[PDB]
Ligand binder design. Sequence first.
Ligand SMILES: NC[C@@H]1O[C@H](O[C@H]2[C@@H](O)[C@H](O[C@@H]3[C@@H](O)[C@H](N)C[C@H](N)[C@H]3O[C@H]3O[C@H](CO)[C@@H](O)[C@H](O)[C@H]3N)O[C@@H]2CO)[C@H](N)[C@@H](O)[C@@H]1O
Ligand SMILES: [Mg+2]
Ligand SMILES: [Mg+2]
Ligand SMILES: [Mg+2]
Ligand SMILES: [Mg+2]
Ligand SMILES: [Mg+2]
Ligand SMILES: [Mg+2]
Ligand SMILES: [Mg+2]
Ligand SMILES: [Mg+2]
Ligand SMILES: [Mg+2]
Ligand SMILES: [Mg+2]
Ligand SMILES: [Mg+2]
Ligand SMILES: [Mg+2]
Ligand SMILES: [Mg+2]
Ligand SMILES: [Mg+2]
Ligand SMILES: [Mg+2]
Ligand SMILES: [Mg+2]
Ligand SMILES: [Mg+2]
Ligand SMILES: [Mg+2]
Ligand SMILES: [Mg+2]
Ligand SMILES: [Mg+2]
Ligand SMILES: [Mg+2]
Ligand SMILES: [Mg+2]
Ligand SMILES: [Mg+2]
Ligand SMILES: [Mg+2]
Ligand SMILES: [Mg+2]
Ligand SMILES: [Mg+2]
Ligand SMILES: [Mg+2]
Ligand SMILES: [Mg+2]
Ligand SMILES: [Mg+2]
Ligand SMILES: [Mg+2]
Ligand SMILES: [Mg+2]
Ligand SMILES: [Mg+2]
Ligand SMILES: [Mg+2]
Ligand SMILES: [Mg+2]
Ligand SMILES: [Mg+2]
Ligand SMILES: [Mg+2]
Ligand SMILES: [Mg+2]
Ligand SMILES: [Mg+2]
Ligand SMILES: [Mg+2]
Ligand SMILES: [Mg+2]
Ligand SMILES: [Mg+2]
Ligand SMILES: [Mg+2]
Ligand SMILES: [Mg+2]
Ligand SMILES: [Mg+2]
Ligand SMILES: [Mg+2]
Ligand SMILES: [Mg+2]
Ligand SMILES: [Mg+2]
Ligand SMILES: [Mg+2]
Ligand SMILES: [Mg+2]
Ligand SMILES: [Mg+2]
Ligand SMILES: [Mg+2]
Ligand SMILES: [Mg+2]
Ligand SMILES: [Mg+2]
Ligand SMILES: [Mg+2]
Ligand SMILES: [Mg+2]
Ligand SMILES: [Mg+2]
Ligand SMILES: [Mg+2]
Ligand SMILES: [Mg+2]
Ligand SMILES: [Mg+2]
Ligand SMILES: [Mg+2]
Ligand SMILES: [Mg+2]
Ligand SMILES: [Mg+2]
Ligand SMILES: [Mg+2]
Ligand SMILES: [Mg+2]
Ligand SMILES: [Mg+2]
Ligand SMILES: [Mg+2]
Ligand SMILES: [Mg+2]
Ligand SMILES: [Mg+2]
Ligand SMILES: [Mg+2]
Ligand SMILES: [Mg+2]
Ligand SMILES: [Mg+2]
Ligand SMILES: [Mg+2]
Ligand SMILES: [Mg+2]
Ligand SMILES: [Mg+2]
Ligand SMILES: [Mg+2]
Ligand SMILES: [Mg+2]
Ligand SMILES: [Mg+2]
Ligand SMILES: [Mg+2]
Ligand SMILES: [Mg+2]
Ligand SMILES: [Mg+2]
Ligand SMILES: [Mg+2]
Ligand SMILES: [Mg+2]
Ligand SMILES: [Mg+2]
Ligand SMILES: [Mg+2]
Ligand SMILES: [Mg+2]
Ligand SMILES: [Mg+2]
Ligand SMILES: [Mg+2]
Ligand SMILES: [Mg+2]
Ligand SMILES: [Mg+2]
Ligand SMILES: [Mg+2]
Ligand SMILES: [Mg+2]
Ligand SMILES: [Mg+2]
Ligand SMILES: [Mg+2]
Ligand SMILES: [Mg+2]
Ligand SMILES: [Mg+2]
Ligand SMILES: [Mg+2]
Ligand SMILES: [Mg+2]
Ligand SMILES: [Mg+2]
Ligand SMILES: [Mg+2]
Ligand SMILES: [Mg+2]
Ligand SMILES: [Mg+2]
Ligand SMILES: [Mg+2]
Ligand SMILES: [Mg+2]
Ligand SMILES: [Mg+2]
Ligand SMILES: [Mg+2]
Ligand SMILES: [Mg+2]
Ligand SMILES: [Mg+2]
Ligand SMILES: [Mg+2]
Ligand SMILES: [Mg+2]
Ligand SMILES: [Mg+2]
Ligand SMILES: [Mg+2]
Ligand SMILES: [Mg+2]
Ligand SMILES: [Mg+2]
Ligand SMILES: [Mg+2]
Ligand SMILES: [Mg+2]
Ligand SMILES: [Mg+2]
Ligand SMILES: [Mg+2]
Ligand SMILES: [Mg+2]
Ligand SMILES: [Mg+2]
Ligand SMILES: [Mg+2]
Ligand SMILES: [Mg+2]
Ligand SMILES: [Mg+2]
Ligand SMILES: [Mg+2]
Ligand SMILES: [Mg+2]
Ligand SMILES: [Mg+2]
Ligand SMILES: [Mg+2]
Ligand SMILES: [Mg+2]
Ligand SMILES: [Mg+2]
Ligand SMILES: [Mg+2]
Ligand SMILES: [Mg+2]
Ligand SMILES: [Mg+2]
Ligand SMILES: [Mg+2]
Ligand SMILES: [Mg+2]
Ligand SMILES: [Mg+2]
Ligand SMILES: [Mg+2]
Ligand SMILES: [Mg+2]
Ligand SMILES: [Mg+2]
Ligand SMILES: [Mg+2]
Ligand SMILES: [Mg+2]
Ligand SMILES: [Mg+2]
Ligand SMILES: [Mg+2]
Ligand SMILES: [Mg+2]
Ligand SMILES: [Mg+2]
Ligand SMILES: [Mg+2]
Ligand SMILES: [Mg+2]
Ligand SMILES: [Mg+2]
Ligand SMILES: [Mg+2]
Ligand SMILES: [Mg+2]
Ligand SMILES: [Mg+2]
Ligand SMILES: [Mg+2]
Ligand SMILES: [Mg+2]
Ligand SMILES: [Mg+2]
Ligand SMILES: [Mg+2]
Ligand SMILES: [Mg+2]
Ligand SMILES: [Mg+2]
Ligand SMILES: [Mg+2]
Ligand SMILES: [Mg+2]
Ligand SMILES: [Mg+2]
Ligand SMILES: [Mg+2]
Ligand SMILES: [Mg+2]
Ligand SMILES: [Mg+2]
Ligand SMILES: [Mg+2]
Ligand SMILES: [Mg+2]
Ligand SMILES: [Mg+2]
Lengths: 272, 49
Amino acid sequence: AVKKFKPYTPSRRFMTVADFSEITKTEPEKSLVKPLKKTGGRNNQGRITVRFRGGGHKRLYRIIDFKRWDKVGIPAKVAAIEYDPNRSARIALLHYVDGEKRYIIAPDGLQVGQQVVAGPDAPIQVGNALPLRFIPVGTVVHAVELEPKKGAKLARAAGTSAQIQGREGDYVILRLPSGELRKVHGECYATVGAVGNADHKNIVLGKAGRSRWLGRRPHVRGAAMNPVDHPHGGGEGRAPRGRPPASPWGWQTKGLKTRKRRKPSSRFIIAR
Amino acid sequence: MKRTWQPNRRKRAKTHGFRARMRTPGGRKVLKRRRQKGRWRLTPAVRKR
RNA sequence: GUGGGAGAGGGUGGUGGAAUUCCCGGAGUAGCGGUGAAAUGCGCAGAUACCGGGAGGAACGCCGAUGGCGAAGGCAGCCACCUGGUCCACCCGUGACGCUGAGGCGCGAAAGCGUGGGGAGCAAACCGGAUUAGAUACCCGGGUAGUCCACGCCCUAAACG
RNA sequence: CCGAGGGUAGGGCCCGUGACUGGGGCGAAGUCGUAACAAGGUAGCUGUACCGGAAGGUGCGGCUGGA
RNA sequence: CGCGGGGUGGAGCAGCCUGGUAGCUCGUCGGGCUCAUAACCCGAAGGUCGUCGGUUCAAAUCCGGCCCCCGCAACCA
RNA sequence: UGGUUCGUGGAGCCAUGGGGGAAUCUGGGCGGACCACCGCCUAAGGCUAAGUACUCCGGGUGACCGAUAGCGCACCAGUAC
RNA sequence: GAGCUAGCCCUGGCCAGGGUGAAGCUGGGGUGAGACCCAGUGGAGGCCCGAACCGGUGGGGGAUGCAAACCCCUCGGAUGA
RNA sequence: GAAUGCCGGCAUGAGUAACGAUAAAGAGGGUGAGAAUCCCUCUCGCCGUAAGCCCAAGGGUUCCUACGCAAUGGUCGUCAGCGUAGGGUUAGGCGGGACCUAAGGUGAAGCCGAAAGGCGUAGCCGAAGGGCAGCCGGUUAAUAUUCCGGCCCUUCCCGCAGGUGCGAUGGGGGGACGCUCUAGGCUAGGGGGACCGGAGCCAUGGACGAGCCCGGCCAGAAGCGCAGGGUGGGAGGUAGGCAAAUCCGCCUCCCAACAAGCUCUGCGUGGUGGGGAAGCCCGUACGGGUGACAACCCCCCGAAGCCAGGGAGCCAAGAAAAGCCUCUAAGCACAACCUGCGGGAACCCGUACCGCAAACCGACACAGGUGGGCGGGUGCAAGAGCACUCAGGCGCGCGGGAGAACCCUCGCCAAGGAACUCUGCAAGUUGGCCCCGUAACUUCGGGAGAAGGGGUGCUCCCUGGGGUGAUGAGCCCCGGGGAGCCGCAGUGAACAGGCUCUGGCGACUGUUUACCAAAAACACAGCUCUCUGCGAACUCGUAAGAGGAGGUAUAGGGAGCGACGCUUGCCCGGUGCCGGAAGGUCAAGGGGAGGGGUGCAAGCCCCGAACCGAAGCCCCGGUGAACGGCGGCCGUAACUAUAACGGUCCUAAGGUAGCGAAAUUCCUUGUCGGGUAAGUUCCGACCUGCACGAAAAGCGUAACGACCGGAGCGCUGUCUCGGCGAGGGACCCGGUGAAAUUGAACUGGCCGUGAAGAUGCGGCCUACCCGUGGCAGGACGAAAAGACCCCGUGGAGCUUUACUGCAGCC
RNA sequence: CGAUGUCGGCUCGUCGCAUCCUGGGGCUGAAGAAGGUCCCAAGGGUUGGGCUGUUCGCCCAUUAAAGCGGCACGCGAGCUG
Ligand SMILES: NC[C@@H]1O[C@H](O[C@H]2[C@@H](O)[C@H](O[C@@H]3[C@@H](O)[C@H](N)C[C@H](N)[C@H]3O[C@H]3O[C@H](CO)[C@@H](O)[C@H](O)[C@H]3N)O[C@@H]2CO)[C@H](N)[C@@H](O)[C@@H]1O
Ligand SMILES: [Mg+2]
Ligand SMILES: [Mg+2]
Ligand SMILES: [Mg+2]
Ligand SMILES: [Mg+2]
Ligand SMILES: [Mg+2]
Ligand SMILES: [Mg+2]
Ligand SMILES: [Mg+2]
Ligand SMILES: [Mg+2]
Ligand SMILES: [Mg+2]
Ligand SMILES: [Mg+2]
Ligand SMILES: [Mg+2]
Ligand SMILES: [Mg+2]
Ligand SMILES: [Mg+2]
Ligand SMILES: [Mg+2]
Ligand SMILES: [Mg+2]
Ligand SMILES: [Mg+2]
Ligand SMILES: [Mg+2]
Ligand SMILES: [Mg+2]
Ligand SMILES: [Mg+2]
Ligand SMILES: [Mg+2]
Ligand SMILES: [Mg+2]
Ligand SMILES: [Mg+2]
Ligand SMILES: [Mg+2]
Ligand SMILES: [Mg+2]
Ligand SMILES: [Mg+2]
Ligand SMILES: [Mg+2]
Ligand SMILES: [Mg+2]
Ligand SMILES: [Mg+2]
Ligand SMILES: [Mg+2]
Ligand SMILES: [Mg+2]
Ligand SMILES: [Mg+2]
Ligand SMILES: [Mg+2]
Ligand SMILES: [Mg+2]
Ligand SMILES: [Mg+2]
Ligand SMILES: [Mg+2]
Ligand SMILES: [Mg+2]
Ligand SMILES: [Mg+2]
Ligand SMILES: [Mg+2]
Ligand SMILES: [Mg+2]
Ligand SMILES: [Mg+2]
Ligand SMILES: [Mg+2]
Ligand SMILES: [Mg+2]
Ligand SMILES: [Mg+2]
Ligand SMILES: [Mg+2]
Ligand SMILES: [Mg+2]
Ligand SMILES: [Mg+2]
Ligand SMILES: [Mg+2]
Ligand SMILES: [Mg+2]
Ligand SMILES: [Mg+2]
Ligand SMILES: [Mg+2]
Ligand SMILES: [Mg+2]
Ligand SMILES: [Mg+2]
Ligand SMILES: [Mg+2]
Ligand SMILES: [Mg+2]
Ligand SMILES: [Mg+2]
Ligand SMILES: [Mg+2]
Ligand SMILES: [Mg+2]
Ligand SMILES: [Mg+2]
Ligand SMILES: [Mg+2]
Ligand SMILES: [Mg+2]
Ligand SMILES: [Mg+2]
Ligand SMILES: [Mg+2]
Ligand SMILES: [Mg+2]
Ligand SMILES: [Mg+2]
Ligand SMILES: [Mg+2]
Ligand SMILES: [Mg+2]
Ligand SMILES: [Mg+2]
Ligand SMILES: [Mg+2]
Ligand SMILES: [Mg+2]
Ligand SMILES: [Mg+2]
Ligand SMILES: [Mg+2]
Ligand SMILES: [Mg+2]
Ligand SMILES: [Mg+2]
Ligand SMILES: [Mg+2]
Ligand SMILES: [Mg+2]
Ligand SMILES: [Mg+2]
Ligand SMILES: [Mg+2]
Ligand SMILES: [Mg+2]
Ligand SMILES: [Mg+2]
Ligand SMILES: [Mg+2]
Ligand SMILES: [Mg+2]
Ligand SMILES: [Mg+2]
Ligand SMILES: [Mg+2]
Ligand SMILES: [Mg+2]
Ligand SMILES: [Mg+2]
Ligand SMILES: [Mg+2]
Ligand SMILES: [Mg+2]
Ligand SMILES: [Mg+2]
Ligand SMILES: [Mg+2]
Ligand SMILES: [Mg+2]
Ligand SMILES: [Mg+2]
Ligand SMILES: [Mg+2]
Ligand SMILES: [Mg+2]
Ligand SMILES: [Mg+2]
Ligand SMILES: [Mg+2]
Ligand SMILES: [Mg+2]
Ligand SMILES: [Mg+2]
Ligand SMILES: [Mg+2]
Ligand SMILES: [Mg+2]
Ligand SMILES: [Mg+2]
Ligand SMILES: [Mg+2]
Ligand SMILES: [Mg+2]
Ligand SMILES: [Mg+2]
Ligand SMILES: [Mg+2]
Ligand SMILES: [Mg+2]
Ligand SMILES: [Mg+2]
Ligand SMILES: [Mg+2]
Ligand SMILES: [Mg+2]
Ligand SMILES: [Mg+2]
Ligand SMILES: [Mg+2]
Ligand SMILES: [Mg+2]
Ligand SMILES: [Mg+2]
Ligand SMILES: [Mg+2]
Ligand SMILES: [Mg+2]
Ligand SMILES: [Mg+2]
Ligand SMILES: [Mg+2]
Ligand SMILES: [Mg+2]
Ligand SMILES: [Mg+2]
Ligand SMILES: [Mg+2]
Ligand SMILES: [Mg+2]
Ligand SMILES: [Mg+2]
Ligand SMILES: [Mg+2]
Ligand SMILES: [Mg+2]
Ligand SMILES: [Mg+2]
Ligand SMILES: [Mg+2]
Ligand SMILES: [Mg+2]
Ligand SMILES: [Mg+2]
Ligand SMILES: [Mg+2]
Ligand SMILES: [Mg+2]
Ligand SMILES: [Mg+2]
Ligand SMILES: [Mg+2]
Ligand SMILES: [Mg+2]
Ligand SMILES: [Mg+2]
Ligand SMILES: [Mg+2]
Ligand SMILES: [Mg+2]
Ligand SMILES: [Mg+2]
Ligand SMILES: [Mg+2]
Ligand SMILES: [Mg+2]
Ligand SMILES: [Mg+2]
Ligand SMILES: [Mg+2]
Ligand SMILES: [Mg+2]
Ligand SMILES: [Mg+2]
Ligand SMILES: [Mg+2]
Ligand SMILES: [Mg+2]
Ligand SMILES: [Mg+2]
Ligand SMILES: [Mg+2]
Ligand SMILES: [Mg+2]
Ligand SMILES: [Mg+2]
Ligand SMILES: [Mg+2]
Ligand SMILES: [Mg+2]
Ligand SMILES: [Mg+2]
Ligand SMILES: [Mg+2]
Ligand SMILES: [Mg+2]
Ligand SMILES: [Mg+2]
Ligand SMILES: [Mg+2]
Ligand SMILES: [Mg+2]
Ligand SMILES: [Mg+2]
Ligand SMILES: [Mg+2]
Ligand SMILES: [Mg+2]
Ligand SMILES: [Mg+2]
Ligand SMILES: [Mg+2]
Ligand SMILES: [Mg+2]
Ligand SMILES: [Mg+2]
Ligand SMILES: [Mg+2]
């Protein structure tokens, strides 16, 4: 839906906030299962190695369930859907009959009170997790494992999915959010449905501060700098570059393919 | 204005203390040099309890 | 009201095959495209033609009509749901309850605008190749918006009987 | 007190005028090209959009005021 | 003032560096087609190569001096 | 590749990072590519005095200084600052 | 050497008093249902005036200074990047 | 004898400048060898959201007392933060530690690295964060929440007594949390009082008066009362909480839906303890006594503090661990653990004083900087603002006279009002609040405090709402209406926008050259390109590893452009990147045709053509929100002019829209038009664009701006054109007393001359010796071994298709 | 070049004369008035504004006139910037 504001201030005239109506009466989270201390820090042991990180709201990590094959066969009741500061998506709090409480990343269409479960069994319904094999060709799916028993790694961003395209002996072909065509092992779990919160892309930050709230420090142009700092630094009053556009570290930034050629992963990929 | 000396007993101790110098080869040599020199004070005297 | 009947009338979901284009595999050569005639273009880096597989999008041949439905604009493969109008029989009920309708409100092809999606074929603009005195055209080879979808605007027409 | 009127301040309407600019009307025999009327030599007309010295062309859908 | 590029039939251009032959398009002229004009078709005409000098057997062409033309430069103060 | 006087040189010898990979005296290395001959040694395990270097420390001597010299310090100096 | 300075990380603190009055909620109106429109309530904001505070705009003074960056009048922000 | 030489010493300027905020002083009396400066009293002035008081950090003897004055104090000094000596810092409850964890640090296991070393789960260290039991008075010259008095607590250990399965570093519960707005009841603090207490006091015209002045509390266990925080009770089934659980969790039925009940805090009350002014007398440097058997009561305001884990709203979604509750395991159940009561045990370190400052950081008793808490009263709409002022603390450690110029700071002015000048720079007008009233334009919010106005004090009369009180008085907030009064003037003092029009640039709030630039620069939401499939790309590191990310294409990196609106045309020839199982070339390697050196030979050892050989390049295609680029010369219309039209040459293609003498226009003050008496600027146009132009974006744009340009109104010492006045200096006296500079000096003008600008040489002219206050023409005056310029085969930062390497990648 | 601060403005002047004005004078194609042109002559005077950093210049309104130049393009230990 997206919340919109009137221009009672500049920067409030474009600003735009998510709709939280799917956030069920459960705004503060769940101890026990999560949260952990989350360790803010824009850099490695010592030095900054990703520029322009820092500031922005304190967070608690929700330790979510990315391998659903523990509770094969054990169903769970979806108890709530809550805000997760550390991902684009929303998260489902679910209660297993087992007693155990996990969070699943919350797919589009998930309703509270719903039944959900994981395993070879598993009715093909939104919320359920299955090894890729038993899932019908053509169904859209998410939180897909890359290699079996290694955890969900594909399609967890808000409003993303992959579609099952066909099969090939032990592998089923996937079409990933990027549009790539991937052979992913049959035995990999993946949960049916799309991610949801799909209006995430429609949000307009609206002002500088908002950027900072999310811990995004001001990014400065190479043009703004000096020859010591950047290939684009200097010279006089503005300058068009004077070389093929580059990163600060000298590599070209328009076109230069960067995936290494001889990756053994290659023989499992069929697209862009 | 604000000058450059902003005394702190803990800082002076953690920074220039006998135990800091002892911790690394760089520092151990400092004690060696100061000893051979005949320095009355190997490290700065940080006070208080 | 009871009882039926025809329908491309509307919205939503789902699905089928033919064909085009791209990919892969097989077999296979020396030309294929194209026009009034040609050229640009494509092709021994293996084209065109043929077979096999895959992907994707748009439009539904035959039925099909000089036919049907709608208030118009308009609506055409199939299935299901939801829903509007309408016509007949019976003459049961109400009982003048009617007609039109400034303004208002809604609907309104195509092209067009916004946000996001999709993009096979076609195709403004655009670039080529011919034609001409010149061609910013007609013909030829390419090709982006757009054409398709969702939501929101736009209100025009030979919206013509 | 009110009060003609003067003063100040800011609006609304109307008329006049302005370098320059926009298109228009009218003016016997200046230029370019051929768009239309005959299948006008690309049927025409049309709403829209884009492009073009110009008439105009082309895309989309429409109409018979054409076969 | 400095620099380097240019003047060729009526128009615009080639021809020079490897000296001896000046060619292309348009235009002009005569004829044909048409009722007529353009288009089109058949024929023809047309150039002291900016001027001055000599180098050579021979200069559009090589080298100097002027002359217009074009472009660049003129910076630190 | 380093070492040697040796800087790729006709470039040996002595070490080695990488690859291939023997033999036990009629076996192996060397004498400046290489080959023949004649000779010299006996690799891939270790230890080993003395002669040699140095002067914090003590002693001796000085065509060495004599308090701006001589050690930074003749003096409570690596101090005060 | 980051006891100045730059950035980030962990944990605390501070921001007088005024204005302006977004959404929403409530009632009323409108419709077939809506949109929408009226109040009333509400208390949003890199909103406004303005201290503390954080700055350093213009002018003057100061120039062997009170001061190796200061003072005076003036001025920007002051719930946020 | 020279080195802007080194070390030292002493001159010069010079009794000069200065003596550190313009908050300010005067006098009487002491002490003393000696008083502007020390003690005291009286008067005066300054601070008072401090210039008062309390914590922290830092400092480290500076605290208190006695005796001292050579030095330290910008003067003096009997004084002191100075010198000598002596004393002074008392804790189970305050802070820190025998408690816990954060970032980070260290680090067993483990990984890595020539060595040094680098990583690194558990653990350990790490604190203004969590946990945690003392409040109010009195004493010292100097400490006290530490000693003492009263009242009240916590842990241990050992006992008795009564309960229960007890029982772990292990499970679970809790602890446990954002920002803004906030209710109810409280305390802190404050205002009033005809009421209670109190020394006293009638002044100078009046007043013996519900007269003035001073003061009317603090702490406090159990138990109560008022607020308020936390929280459901059963019973079953159980596969999860990494063994086990009765615990938690999940399901299912019953009872509650309430704070009813249990707790747990805060506040009042409390046995009791304590405090208790003005004024007067005293002798202190200061405190003591009396006032007093002090009284110790009623109203009202009221927090940002308390109840606290209160409530509502919002998105950016808001530490950890221990203590504490509970659950069970090993074990043990003559243990143990809980509850009650006794007795005993309770260590270590800090404690002085300074602390917005003369004791801290600035070489100084330095106009600077320094974190947290309290910070009274009255008035001004409010307030931590502003004026006065409590408590309390100060007069800033040189003075005294004078009444010149000149400077700083301030006040006022005839007439004119920007004529000043680069510019209204500066200075002035304006100013708070209530009420009228407000345009273009606009993104519908704004522009808006637009503009422009009026009201503002005091007195009496009538009168409307609330709050606290019972529905009332008072007390406290807000209002309305009616007469009148005084002054030049009623936010009568202090604090408190000058306004408009129109362009440029940037959308906007923000950021920046700390110490000459705050901007039109950076940033910014947003837009497009491009890389990246996850052991991602990329970045740091030799590595291990880490960031990215405990993320996964709506995500992450790189680049540009920079809200928004309308839009971003053509060129892929070169360079870049992307795509091409063809070809050409291409190294090590493979291969050996063939030949060479020695050997009597078997042999050993050399070169070596075909030919198979990667990426890279060449070659073939693509691609401009990739690097970039986007023409010339002639002719032509029935007045001239001009050129829709044409010819030709070249290119990869020949700048479209829109803008244009511009932050771009050289010729240039282009040419018209507007503002003006007059306009190199400014605004609107034309286009002949030296040398605009479409994401180094193009043309626009409401709003915003300590940005930059132009105009007008208002107002003024900016100016005509100055004048006067104030105070701080300047000047004279007493006290302390520098500095750069300096070859030596017995240092005149003119015309000459001289290395070409002479106090010094020549001629001439002038001129008695020495100072004081002033002015700056000169001493090519001081200051910096010229910044510009050149030179040196001097140095650095930067660039690239300079050379040569290296990391990196293929 | 071990430093001669560099445009313009302001402030204060001063000097030369090849004089802009005023005084004196000759010729004039000087009727008079007013001009023209040369000679003598510096004693004194030589305005205020608009644009521009400007010097200069162009205007505006006046005037007896709106003089040229020198003094380190006079003058920054005098100011401005
Ligand atoms: N005529 C009415 C409107 O104006 C234009 O018309 C004007 C012009 O286009 C037109 O020009 C014509 C030209 O078209 C035609 N081919 C040649 C003719 N000689 C010209 O003629 C014109 O100019 C001359 C002077 O030179 C006058 O004397 C004459 O009257 C006038 N018509 O003359 C018209 C003036 O009246 C539009 N073209 C026309 O279609 C439109 O409807
Ligand atoms: Mg690192
Ligand atoms: Mg480290
Ligand atoms: Mg978008
Ligand atoms: Mg940036
Ligand atoms: Mg820069
Ligand atoms: Mg570089
Ligand atoms: Mg430039
Ligand atoms: Mg360039
Ligand atoms: Mg550059
Ligand atoms: Mg094939
Ligand atoms: Mg029906
Ligand atoms: Mg009937
Ligand atoms: Mg009737
Ligand atoms: Mg009708
Ligand atoms: Mg429509
Ligand atoms: Mg359409
Ligand atoms: Mg468009
Ligand atoms: Mg669209
Ligand atoms: Mg096509
Ligand atoms: Mg076509
Ligand atoms: Mg019809
Ligand atoms: Mg008009
Ligand atoms: Mg036609
Ligand atoms: Mg025609
Ligand atoms: Mg036609
Ligand atoms: Mg059309
Ligand atoms: Mg076209
Ligand atoms: Mg008609
Ligand atoms: Mg002819
Ligand atoms: Mg220079
Ligand atoms: Mg230069
Ligand atoms: Mg060597
Ligand atoms: Mg080896
Ligand atoms: Mg050997
Ligand atoms: Mg050998
Ligand atoms: Mg040998
Ligand atoms: Mg030999
Ligand atoms: Mg030997
Ligand atoms: Mg001697
Ligand atoms: Mg000595
Ligand atoms: Mg001696
Ligand atoms: Mg010495
Ligand atoms: Mg820091
Ligand atoms: Mg506020
Ligand atoms: Mg409202
Ligand atoms: Mg507010
Ligand atoms: Mg604000
Ligand atoms: Mg405060
Ligand atoms: Mg700053
Ligand atoms: Mg300032
Ligand atoms: Mg000065
Ligand atoms: Mg301020
Ligand atoms: Mg503000
Ligand atoms: Mg403010
Ligand atoms: Mg000498
Ligand atoms: Mg000396
Ligand atoms: Mg003197
Ligand atoms: Mg003096
Ligand atoms: Mg003096
Ligand atoms: Mg003083
Ligand atoms: Mg005063
Ligand atoms: Mg005496
Ligand atoms: Mg006062
Ligand atoms: Mg002492
Ligand atoms: Mg003392
Ligand atoms: Mg004494
Ligand atoms: Mg003294
Ligand atoms: Mg004495
Ligand atoms: Mg003492
Ligand atoms: Mg102990
Ligand atoms: Mg500890
Ligand atoms: Mg370590
Ligand atoms: Mg750790
Ligand atoms: Mg610990
Ligand atoms: Mg604590
Ligand atoms: Mg404690
Ligand atoms: Mg004390
Ligand atoms: Mg006690
Ligand atoms: Mg137990
Ligand atoms: Mg626990
Ligand atoms: Mg009290
Ligand atoms: Mg009396
Ligand atoms: Mg009282
Ligand atoms: Mg268990
Ligand atoms: Mg007393
Ligand atoms: Mg709460
Ligand atoms: Mg622990
Ligand atoms: Mg103490
Ligand atoms: Mg104390
Ligand atoms: Mg303080
Ligand atoms: Mg003090
Ligand atoms: Mg002092
Ligand atoms: Mg101070
Ligand atoms: Mg000090
Ligand atoms: Mg401060
Ligand atoms: Mg207060
Ligand atoms: Mg107050
Ligand atoms: Mg008050
Ligand atoms: Mg006020
Ligand atoms: Mg104040
Ligand atoms: Mg005046
Ligand atoms: Mg006056
Ligand atoms: Mg006036
Ligand atoms: Mg002026
Ligand atoms: Mg002037
Ligand atoms: Mg101006
Ligand atoms: Mg001003
Ligand atoms: Mg305005
Ligand atoms: Mg009045
Ligand atoms: Mg800006
Ligand atoms: Mg600066
Ligand atoms: Mg500044
Ligand atoms: Mg600024
Ligand atoms: Mg944009
Ligand atoms: Mg990693
Ligand atoms: Mg991570
Ligand atoms: Mg930019
Ligand atoms: Mg472009
Ligand atoms: Mg190109
Ligand atoms: Mg290319
Ligand atoms: Mg190409
Ligand atoms: Mg390639
Ligand atoms: Mg080879
Ligand atoms: Mg190759
Ligand atoms: Mg074009
Ligand atoms: Mg122009
Ligand atoms: Mg003009
Ligand atoms: Mg003016
Ligand atoms: Mg004018
Ligand atoms: Mg203009
Ligand atoms: Mg530009
Ligand atoms: Mg561009
Ligand atoms: Mg821009
Ligand atoms: Mg513009
Ligand atoms: Mg604007
Ligand atoms: Mg700003
Ligand atoms: Mg600004
Ligand atoms: Mg004045
Ligand atoms: Mg005066
Ligand atoms: Mg005075
Ligand atoms: Mg004196
Ligand atoms: Mg000297
Ligand atoms: Mg003399
Ligand atoms: Mg001379
Ligand atoms: Mg002499
Ligand atoms: Mg002389
Ligand atoms: Mg003198
Ligand atoms: Mg002088
Ligand atoms: Mg002076
Ligand atoms: Mg001078
Ligand atoms: Mg020099
Ligand atoms: Mg050289
Ligand atoms: Mg010089
Ligand atoms: Mg000198
Ligand atoms: Mg000098
Ligand atoms: Mg004369
Ligand atoms: Mg005369
Ligand atoms: Mg000016
Ligand atoms: Mg002069
Ligand atoms: Mg000159
Ligand atoms: Mg000049
Ligand atoms: Mg000068
Ligand atoms: Mg001077
Ligand atoms: Mg300047």
